[PDB]
Amino acid sequence: VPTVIFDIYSRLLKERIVFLVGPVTDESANLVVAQLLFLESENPDKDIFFYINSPGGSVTAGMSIYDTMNFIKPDVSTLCLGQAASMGAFLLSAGEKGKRFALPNSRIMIHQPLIGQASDIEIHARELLKIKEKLNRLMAKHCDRDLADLERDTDRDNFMSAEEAKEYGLIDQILENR
Amino acid sequence: FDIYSRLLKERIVFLVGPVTDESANLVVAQLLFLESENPDKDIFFYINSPGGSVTAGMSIYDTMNFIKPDVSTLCLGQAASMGAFLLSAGEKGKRFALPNSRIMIHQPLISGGQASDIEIHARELLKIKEKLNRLMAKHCDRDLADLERDTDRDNFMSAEEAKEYGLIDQILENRAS
Amino acid sequence: VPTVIFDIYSRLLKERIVFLVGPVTDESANLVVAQLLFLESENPDKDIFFYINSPGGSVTAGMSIYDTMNFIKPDVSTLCLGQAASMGAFLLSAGEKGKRFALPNSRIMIHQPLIGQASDIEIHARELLKIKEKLNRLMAKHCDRDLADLERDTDRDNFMSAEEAKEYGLIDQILENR
Amino acid sequence: VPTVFDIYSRLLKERIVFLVGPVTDESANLVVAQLLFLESENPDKDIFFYINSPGGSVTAGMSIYDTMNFIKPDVSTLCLGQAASMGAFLLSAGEKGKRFALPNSRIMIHQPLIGGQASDIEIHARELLKIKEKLNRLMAKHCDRDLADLERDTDRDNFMSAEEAKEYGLIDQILENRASL
Amino acid sequence: VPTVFDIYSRLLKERIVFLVGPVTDESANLVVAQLLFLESENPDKDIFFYINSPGGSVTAGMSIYDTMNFIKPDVSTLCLGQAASMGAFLLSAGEKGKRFALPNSRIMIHQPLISGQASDIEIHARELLKIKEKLNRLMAKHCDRDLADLERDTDRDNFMSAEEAKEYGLIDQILENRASLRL
Amino acid sequence: FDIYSRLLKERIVFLVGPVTDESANLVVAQLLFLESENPDKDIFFYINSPGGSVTAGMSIYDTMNFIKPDVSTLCLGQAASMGAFLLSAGEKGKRFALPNSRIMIHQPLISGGQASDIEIHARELLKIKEKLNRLMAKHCDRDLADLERDTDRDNFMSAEEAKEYGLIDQILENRAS
Amino acid sequence: FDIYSRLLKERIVFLVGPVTDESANLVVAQLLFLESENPDKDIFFYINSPGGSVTAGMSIYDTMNFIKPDVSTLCLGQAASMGAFLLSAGEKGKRFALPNSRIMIHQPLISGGQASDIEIHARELLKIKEKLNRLMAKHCDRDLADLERDTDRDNFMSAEEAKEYGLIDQILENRASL
Amino acid sequence: VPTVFDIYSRLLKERIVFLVGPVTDESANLVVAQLLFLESENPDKDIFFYINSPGGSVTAGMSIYDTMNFIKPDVSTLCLGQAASMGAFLLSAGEKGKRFALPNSRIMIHQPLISGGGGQASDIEIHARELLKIKEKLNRLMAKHCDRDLADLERDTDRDNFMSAEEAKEYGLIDQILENRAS
Amino acid sequence: LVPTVFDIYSRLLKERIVFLVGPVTDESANLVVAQLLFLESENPDKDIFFYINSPGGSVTAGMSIYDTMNFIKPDVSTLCLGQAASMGAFLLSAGEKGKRFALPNSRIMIHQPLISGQASDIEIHARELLKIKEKLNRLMAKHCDRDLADLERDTDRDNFMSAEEAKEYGLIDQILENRA
């Protein structure tokens, strides 16, 4: 990691840029949370720019970012570069309405969740199903779409170009340059 | 002409160790062989097994009920899980255990995919659980509610306890029993 | 394997019983083919009783049994014990019409197929899709059902009791005893 | 971890302590150390204990729990992502009225879960059952519920939404943002 | 195995049955099968059950135990090399007065040993303690001893010489050769 | 204050080895850092890479085109697969290779599921293949048909050949070139 | 600037996890340092350990007794095996446990060679067993016969049971508990 | 295994029994079974027990030893290649006067040795005591086989003690070195 | 991985304390050698305190420490804490006579060398091992002020000694209980 007179990523936090790169785990998600809280403390009255290149990962770890995005005072602008798939698309669509962006050749993908005793099986299947539904409802709200749309369109892997994600309502604009 | 083929002449069939498709079908084949040789004489099905696959156990179960001979069952060592299910399925009046054998019964237990596929497989597993409880209640002359409660977790029984439960008919200490 | 004065399975071939047990592989399927051909040679004018307890397996290995069932002169009666899933259900439904049976607590399951360079990917996906369709059409013929029924009902794993498989048209009768 | 001091050390200066991931002897004592550090720096200010954890070792979690209660600062807890098993126990141990969950977090509670001679197995089985009852009694106290409630409700994995966790008594309030307070 | 209808098959004609090595479901049921065969061949003649075993599965050993007691032939037992654990149990289970050991064999007895949720741990610990108690009671019967003796004497591994096992009541005689037999 | 941070002062950014999400984002971060420091001066993007993830390469690609500075590219050692794609994406007129570097281009290459899922993923992969061919044709000033044919299998090019193909602009032997 | 170094300024030393040569010597080094900085101030030795090597534990034990400062001990989480030994070894009157910590004591446990060598090491282990029982009896103000009986198999104790036993002096719920 | 039935069964007809390789429960019991078969076939003719073994389990070797002493036939022993450890013990247990070695074979004797292994100090004390009982027992039995003082065997088995055929003859472990039948 | 107060072991090096912890290897032994030379350089007129908790390790690595202890001008006092076994006990016994110490519950263990091709090569390496065995028994007899035959007898198998037994044998000079 390059240094400059701190590391490259801490240098970019001075631009209020936070990256999510690769799979969403508790550890990688909480690193994003900590940067969000740090930037809000630095200045609660300036936007944050959350750049997302992720294939997805843990639902609960993603929810920790999601709820932090909505809790803190700064607007969280989101930007898809490379790809935002699964929980990465979810967080992308969670950016402040009107501040959700994708680079022109990035892609988006949305899908339903994917992963003892009979009694335990029943328990885990039921929570998975609730997650499924919760994700569909929150995504429909993000996209200003009907729940039944999301239920249909996440049944199997649904890849979208930046244009298709814009029409779907997952992002607001495709940015080619400043 | 091994020892087991020799006892096959006595119409004794063993199930030893885990219930798999392969070990179950070996039992099924012997049951059909014995029915072919003599459809009008009892078969003695000796079970010493920790359990194993439900569907493989069901292949033995339905063959037991399909063939003309009464399939007497005998627990030696243990009959646990699908082994107890098969023991309890012997012809009523002809289900036996040796005095220090033990029986264990419990609900289905499993060792991925989309939530849609998990849902389907959870529901099939619950149907299996209900079916086994219903069949076992029939075997033991008990209410379904008893079986549902009594198989929530591993339930070990002595030979006497399994008799009192309704899983077998008599404890045999020797022939004079 | 018990012997009797040959092994237990060769003894049951005298009853014209052939077993399929466990996964369908080239080797296990071809063993079934060889027994079918042997029994036809022994007497072309008597039924064969094909007992199936299988979770499925290779499509092409199953087709070797399927086409042999239809080629040889004896009617091939089929019987589900334990389970016939995937290619096992396919072969079960392929038995001579009116001679397809299931034991009372067996189960049936049907589903669509499941498994380099971009060019190669295209090639394998296309053959998989053809298999999908071929399986659906042959199953619809076996079941006296519309193709679109099979397409809907094999999209995900579709478990059926013996009664449900009978109503679906996969078997003819449920046998409890002789 | 971005560094100049890293991001977690910087937020520690705001009196935020994180529990992230499995509760081990090492992750738990790191939490204990931070709690003691913040008390020594100012024994009179609240500490904000943010938990995203699937659970882990009971005795390791107990070291955090007793430290939370030993130190003079109120320890406020926040559930973000999830607080499961010992994570949920620690969440419910925050200062009453200061236990929080974010709106889409989840909580899960359950009984304990893990050779020798039969004498040794008996001893360890007994010890595990004492732990089971101790944790159900402590949790009931946190939730202002009965021991019998917790025994029924932890027999298998019991997942709760933030609202369900609030109604149960595990947390005091769901915070969408600061205006929720 | 020399094929003289092999060597063990040949000795089965002398009504000798071996247990060699660990007691598993597979080795235990082979012993059971042979016991049933020899009873079928002649129900009024003794069987000689030669044991050289470190132990193994309790439930598998119980299948042999209950078979020994079920069939009509007396099952005489002989310790050669060792009979440890469930091996010792089966040795002590032979027909009283026909339990033997060679002079430098050894016997060992001990309580059960094992190599989920708390609810399931409780259920399985309780069952292991039931097994421990049952084995101690059955052993006290075989040895004509107080239950309390066996509880004390199986707490840890209890190695005994042939003479110690005879004085314990676990076997009846030590045989150096055929001329050794008494009574 | 390592050697690479020192060359970062010269506005040199390296991509060395496989293109992954992590190595690509490290490149992206440096491009954004350099634009922040000076949006009005060229960046020199030195590529020695066998390729790697398409989507990770796309994150670099779109950042190159998004930021204000011209991103000059230089192939040293090799630029293969997504490495050649990035090399070809440098600001036109400012794409370079050293004389003994080599370039390789090819169609997408992948290392399960239901036929429905295989179909979806095969089709996405074909869209990627078409997209890369279309973008590369734009970079090289060639017809799409040329790229489609020329990437069917691994296509190795010398520095001269890549220049003649349209992938780079000049071969630099030294500065006087 | 790390947190354990910071806490060392409060004269707090931690033993966390298994007692090894390396982790025990790190404790030794901190005890020597704190004595060097101020030989007339108490040291607070916080223990959360499942036990470990007896000889490594003895290096801590003898260091605790060698240095001039009183070494107060605190059980947090658990103090088992050599962890309990060191807990009980703190300056009498200054041995504490948190309310939900646990203590466990047991005889020595080893997880090859000629009979002569096995004889030698078996005898050394029995000397160790007797040394630990005798020293622990002294720490608890109890009989040698008590400890011999009470460590034959794993013996778990609540904080109240440990106090009753004499292994610690007081249970601290908070500072007002002293 | 050539089949002319197989070669070893054919040599069994000549009352030759092999122990080859390590002494395990399974390899020991096969020897016991052959010894009992040959006694059954003729209880008065010598058995020739050929030993090429590096040793193995004590209790397994004790099953053979006690069987050799139990049966009516004299068991002559012949060392070929090597008899080490429990192999050497069994070599020395052959009928006195009929213990032989081929001229370039070797013998090795040593005290008991445990491969590796575990547990509480009480348990380790129990098993170390049993191992020392076994060490003493083997030393006394070998002293008797060799017609030597116990103290000799204790000294001479402290570490691995390799002996040529002539050294083993001098020691009292064997009676004669056979280069051919004329010996 | 080590408290910083740089670090705690560097801080105790200011007190002229050097640790040997765990197995003696070329790397851990050269680190001890480096610290001894450093402390000699800083002040050749003060003792070094060499604290040993070690199960042993390489003979040649141990010899690099031993000859360095004897080469430098400072007295190297040794202290057994926890245990000093094998080469650890050798080095403990090698401290400046009168300045070799053990804490009351430490233990010492001494034994003969122990290791975990062509016959010619086997003969060569076996002869070298026996030279090492003989050299260590002679050097240890010298440190213990004992006859060589005593050491030959007492190292034939693992010989565990309490602190008192080690003092009586001659391996250490005094047992230290507290700082006063």
Ligand SMILES: CC(C)(C(=O)NCCSc1ccccc1C(F)(F)F)S(=O)(=O)c1ccc(C(F)(F)F)cn1
């Ligand atoms: C995040 C994913 C990986 C997920 O399920 N993570 C954790 C599940 S944890 C688990 C495991 C076993 C047993 C019980 C559980 C528990 F119940 F606890 F969860 S998801 O891939 O399936 C997913 C969700 C949403 C989207 C969308 F945004 F596109 F809409 C895309 N992907």
Ligand SMILES: CC(C)(C(=O)NCCSc1ccccc1C(F)(F)F)S(=O)(=O)c1ccc(C(F)(F)F)cn1
């Ligand atoms: C037999 C057991 C091992 C079992 O579940 N086998 C089949 C697993 S395959 C499977 C895997 C994933 C998804 C779906 C499936 C499937 F659809 F196939 F099931 S059981 O342990 O659960 C058991 C149940 C009942 C009893 C009683 F009889 F005592 F009452 C005893 N044992």
Ligand SMILES: CC(C)(C(=O)NCCSc1ccccc1C(F)(F)F)S(=O)(=O)c1ccc(C(F)(F)F)cn1
């Ligand atoms: C049989 C199954 C396992 C299958 O696909 N076997 C072999 C595929 S080979 C392959 C692999 C890689 C690349 C290309 C190929 C190829 F193209 F060559 F095939 S199936 O499970 O999917 C299935 C089919 C039908 C049914 C029904 F009957 F229920 F209807 C159930 N299951």
Ligand SMILES: CC(C)(C(=O)NCCSc1ccccc1C(F)(F)F)S(=O)(=O)c1ccc(C(F)(F)F)cn1
């Ligand atoms: C913490 C868990 C992992 C646990 O048991 N840890 C350590 C056990 S250590 C052990 C291992 C073997 C032998 C003996 C022992 C010993 F006895 F020493 F413990 S728990 O999952 O089971 C759990 C507890 C409570 C909750 C609640 F909060 F929701 F209520 C959730 N989970």
Ligand SMILES: CC(C)(C(=O)NCCSc1ccccc1C(F)(F)F)S(=O)(=O)c1ccc(C(F)(F)F)cn1
């Ligand atoms: C036989 C042994 C190996 C044994 O425990 N077998 C199976 C245990 S069952 C078990 C384990 C875990 C969970 C559930 C279960 C279950 F439910 F299955 F029980 S024993 O060696 O321990 C033994 C017994 C008796 C004697 C005596 F004679 F000497 F007295 C000596 N040894």
Ligand SMILES: CC(C)(C(=O)NCCSc1ccccc1C(F)(F)F)S(=O)(=O)c1ccc(C(F)(F)F)cn1
């Ligand atoms: C980059 C490579 C490694 C690639 O395919 N990465 C992404 C794989 S992930 C994946 C896996 C399964 C299902 C779907 C997907 C997904 F949807 F994600 F793609 S490439 O080798 O194929 C390549 C392509 C083009 C060129 C050119 F630039 F020269 F023209 C060079 N290299």
Ligand SMILES: CC(C)(C(=O)NCCSc1ccccc1C(F)(F)F)S(=O)(=O)c1ccc(C(F)(F)F)cn1
């Ligand atoms: C510390 C333990 C792990 C122990 O034995 N460590 C090292 C042994 S080293 C060894 C290994 C092999 C051969 C020889 C040896 C040697 F002889 F060298 F030791 S102990 O668990 O057994 C234990 C002791 C005391 C307590 C109490 F405090 F509760 F009382 C609890 N536990």
Ligand SMILES: CC(C)(C(=O)NCCSc1ccccc1C(F)(F)F)S(=O)(=O)c1ccc(C(F)(F)F)cn1
């Ligand atoms: C046979 C050998 C391998 C042996 O010890 N087997 C017994 C292992 S059982 C065991 C395992 C763990 C714990 C305790 C025990 C038990 F206590 F039960 F033993 S021996 O090599 O040591 C040997 C002995 C004698 C001779 C001589 F004849 F020359 F003199 C040569 N070799």
Ligand SMILES: CC(C)(C(=O)NCCSc1ccccc1C(F)(F)F)S(=O)(=O)c1ccc(C(F)(F)F)cn1
């Ligand atoms: C140091 C030990 C580990 C040792 O042998 N190290 C050197 C291995 S090098 C080697 C490897 C292969 C072939 C040849 C060789 C070579 F010949 F080179 F060595 S020692 O433990 O055995 C030991 C010695 C003495 C004492 C005493 F102090 F107590 F007296 C204690 N211990």
